[PDB]
Design a protein around this nucleic acid. Structure first.
Ligand code: CA
Length: 579
DNA sequence: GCGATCAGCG
DNA sequence: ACGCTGATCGCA
């Protein structure tokens, strides 16, 4: 039905200075994936190009790389990274419909052009699932069907830029889109394509030793149970723990007994088997997720892994990382933390450099709540996580172990995000009356934080949503629910989303400023990863001293709050050693 | 496919 | 009965 030119070659009217562009990559993981077709829509008409001709045409390649030739797209990072794997640079992306829809409403779950278009009553385009199919039936349709679908997606983007930009402007989000999310998308594309080199010899050797240790722990388990059984079957595990050994039942799931790590730690005084089970799960988690799982996604020729940073997924404005997830590599236990020895620089005589914001969300909270005592604490550069551990465990600063500080950390965030006295009691193995009175003492020291929690909930009720410092938005319809439990979850979102989301705004701006500064200084240093409030770079070892001065300062000056921001940083031969 | 579990970030 | 995630695994 929709008219377009099925081109056999590239003509000049296809190369206008504004166009909607579709560069179609059907595989979910777009690294090194086929480009199946290209569509262009501009003032001169609608065009479909086969990639084998468009991407070898020197005028089309120059047009793609000309930043003054402006393109509107959906998920331009998918396109940009797929084009890098074809050796082609995409520049000039001035509107991204995926990122525009994400800002307007992250809960929509927009995953293709049709779902974005539906937000503005535009329905002249089919969902990608209807054209390609689902699961094992996924297939590229034949050329006529493929080309009409790509042209319809391009025409939708063409028509939708203005009504999306208009609503972004009304929401105070247009500069958020155009100066933050869209430049960040090109930086993530570079990070994803650079990848992270992995020491596969050391990883495989760890995997060998691990399997030997797994079998040993597994036999002490069978010997402590007096019998063999399946350690990962809840049924058989419940029989050993709760019927055979007759341990107390502290917690049930919807399917039966709970055996989560918090339950098993509480059972450790009763029987030695439960701590062996914990060691066994931890060893097994490393093997399946961080050894085997990681080797499966290493590209063998370069020994690099290439994550995908989902930039339009989380409800707070955070990124997520997938296949592999490089944002949850073990660190807390020494056995798992050794995994990070396998992440190495991509050139000899380069180093890994890591920089991290200190107590980022509490500094953001101090600023947003304008709490006098919390603002003073950070103006003194106090370590609030350590101070809370001193108070909890009634020890001195010199005696705070890494674990107590990590514990107190869950206490600080738990309290400001609405933990109940019950929840706090369970978390610390203390009484519920002592839990409630600790919480009341905590808000007596920080009355501005308490006022803020009450006020933000009220504002969410009035407005129907909450916002972050850079005007990211999250709608909270459940805030006025008749159901107490549904309303309560919404109130804790109203307490947490402005703080976590503002911390996400800040590090994103820091990344944009960092990239610009590295380029102005003509350094080879470049970002590899973001881990929510941490940035990880690699660079020639001769740039490290300049990075020690440049990176902390760029991150600390990304925004100006009522308290200082503070950055810790380390560098070394591996990711393990950058700490 | 989902729920439980557990790895990270706060 | 703090929040935000992704990968794995058994299936009660
Ligand atoms: Ca931090």
């Amino acid at each position: 039905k929709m008219a377009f030119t099925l081109a056999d070659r590239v003509t000049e009217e296809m190369l206008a200075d504004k166009a909607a562009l579709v560069v179609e990559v059907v595989e979910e993981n777009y690294h090194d994936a086929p480009i199946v077709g290209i569509a262009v829509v501009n003032e001169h008409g609608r065009f479909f190009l086969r990639p084998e001709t468009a991407l070898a045409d020197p005028q089309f390649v120059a047009w793609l790389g000309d930043e003054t030739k402006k393109k509107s797209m959906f998920d331009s990072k998918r396109a940009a990274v797929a084009l890098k794997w074809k050796g082609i640079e995409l520049c000039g992306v001035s509107f991204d419909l995926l990122l525009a829809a994400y800002l307007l409403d992250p809960a929509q779950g927009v995953d293709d052009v049709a779902a974005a278009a539906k937000m503005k009553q535009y329905e002249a385009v089919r969902p990608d699932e209807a054209v390609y199919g689902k699961g094992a039936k996924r297939a590229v349709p034949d050329e006529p069907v493929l080309a009409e679908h790509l042209v319809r997606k391009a025409a939708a983007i063409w028509e939708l830029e203005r009504p999306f930009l208009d609503e972004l402007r009304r929401n105070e989000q247009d500069r958020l889109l155009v100066e933050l999310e869209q430049p960040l998308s090109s930086i993530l594309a570079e990070m994803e394509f650079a990848g992270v080199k992995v020491d596969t010899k050391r990883l495989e050797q760890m995997g060998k030793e691990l399997a030997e240790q797994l079998g040993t722990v597994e036999q002490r388990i069978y010997e402590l149970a007096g019998q063999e059984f399946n350690i990962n079957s809840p049924k058989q595990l419940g029989v050993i723990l709760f019927e055979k050994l007759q341990l107390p039942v502290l917690k049930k799931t919807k399917t039966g007994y709970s055996t989560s790590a918090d339950v098993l730690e509480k059972l450790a005084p009763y029987h030695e088997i439960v701590e062996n089970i914990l060691h066994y799960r931890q060893l097994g988690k490393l093997q399946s997720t961080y050894i085997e799982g990681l080797l499966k996604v290493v590209r063998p020729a370069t020994k690099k892994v290439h994550t995908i940073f989902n930039q339009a997924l989380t409800q707070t404005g955070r990124l997520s990382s997938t296949e592999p997830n490089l944002q949850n590599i073990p660190i807390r236990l020494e056995e798992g933390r050794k995994i990070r020895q396998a992440f190495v620089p991509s050139e000899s005589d380069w180093l890994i450099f890591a920089a991290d914001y200190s107590q980022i969300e509490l500094r953001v909270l101090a600023h947003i709540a304008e709490d006098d005592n919390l603002m003073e604490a950070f103006r003194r550069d106090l370590d609030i996580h350590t101070k809370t551990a001193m108070d909890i465990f009634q020890v001195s600063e010199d005696e705070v172990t890494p674990n107590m500080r990590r514990q107190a950390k869950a206490v600080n965030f738990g309290i400001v995000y609405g933990i109940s006295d019950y929840g706090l009691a369970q978390n610390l193995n203390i009484s519920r009356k002592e839990a409630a009175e600790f919480i009341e003492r905590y808000f007596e020291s920080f009355p501005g934080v308490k006022r803020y929690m009450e006020n933000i909930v009220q504002e969410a009720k009035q407005k129907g949503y909450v916002t972050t410092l850079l005007h990211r938005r999250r709608y909270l319809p459940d805030i006025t629910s008749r159901n107490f439990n549904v309303r309560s979850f919404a109130e804790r979102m109203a307490m947490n989303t402005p703080i976590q989301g503002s911390a996400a705004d800040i590090i994103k701006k820091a990344m944009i400023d960092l990239n610009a500064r590295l380029k102005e200084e003509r350094l080879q240093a470049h970002l590899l990863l973001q881990v929510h409030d941490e940035l990880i770079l690699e660079a020639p070892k001769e740039e490290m001293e300049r990075l020690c001065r440049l990176v902390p300062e760029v991150m600390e000056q990304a925004v100006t709050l009522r308290v200082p921001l503070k950055v810790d940083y380390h560098y070394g031969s591996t990711w393990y050693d950058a700490k």
